[PDB]
């Protein structure tokens, strides 16, 4: 005599992946914040193939993509070409 059981649920995406998405084949990073039916902030990937997927934000490979959007550092070498013209 089972009745209508409430269960944990989230915002249903277009689709998800079982394969690690190519860091090179990423086009843009779209964000789904909490309140959108999502208990968790989830990252929607748009690929170069125009494949629309929602992957876990704390996926171990995606960490580099989240590090790619922010600055790491900056360095530059300003130097004049030391052209030591010397026949004698």
Swiss-Prot record:
Function text: Strongly chemotactic for B-lymphocytes, weakly for spleen monocytes and macrophages but no chemotactic activity for granulocytes. Binds to BLR1/CXCR5. May play a role in directing the migration of B-lymphocytes to follicles in secondary lymphoid organs.
Protein name, as recorded: C-X-C motif chemokine 13
Protein species of origin: Mus musculus (Mouse)
Upper lineage: Eukaryota, Metazoa, Chordata, Craniata, Vertebrata
Assigned keywords, A-Z: Chemotaxis, Cytokine, Disulfide bond, Inflammatory response, Secreted, Signal
Family as reported in the entry's similarity comment: Belongs to the intercrine alpha (chemokine CxC) family.
Superkingdom classification of source: Eukaryota
GO molecular function: CCR10 chemokine receptor binding; chemokine activity; CXCR3 chemokine receptor binding; CXCR5 chemokine receptor binding; fibroblast growth factor binding; heparin binding; receptor ligand activity
Entry GO CC: extracellular region; extracellular space
Tissue: Found in spleen (B-cell-rich zone or follicles), Peyer patches (strongest within germinal centers and extending to the mantle zone) and lymph nodes (in reticular pattern in follicles).
Disulfide bonds: 11-38, 13-54
Chief location: secreted
A biological process term (GO) from this entry: chemokine-mediated signaling pathway
Gene: Cxcl13
Localization annotation: Secreted
């Amino acid at each position: 005599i089972l009745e209508a059981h409430y269960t944990n649920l989230k915002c249903r995406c277009s689709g998800v992946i079982s394969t690690v998405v190519g860091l090179n084949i990423i086009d843009r990073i779209q964000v789904t914040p909490p309140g959108n039916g999502c208990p968790k902030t989830e990252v929607v990937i748009w690929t170069k193939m125009k494949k629309v997927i929602c992957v876990n934000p704390r996926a171990k490979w995606l960490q580099r993509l989240l590090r790619h959007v922010q600055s790491k550092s900056l360095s530059s070498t300003p130097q004049a070409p030391v052209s030591k013209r010397r026949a004698a």
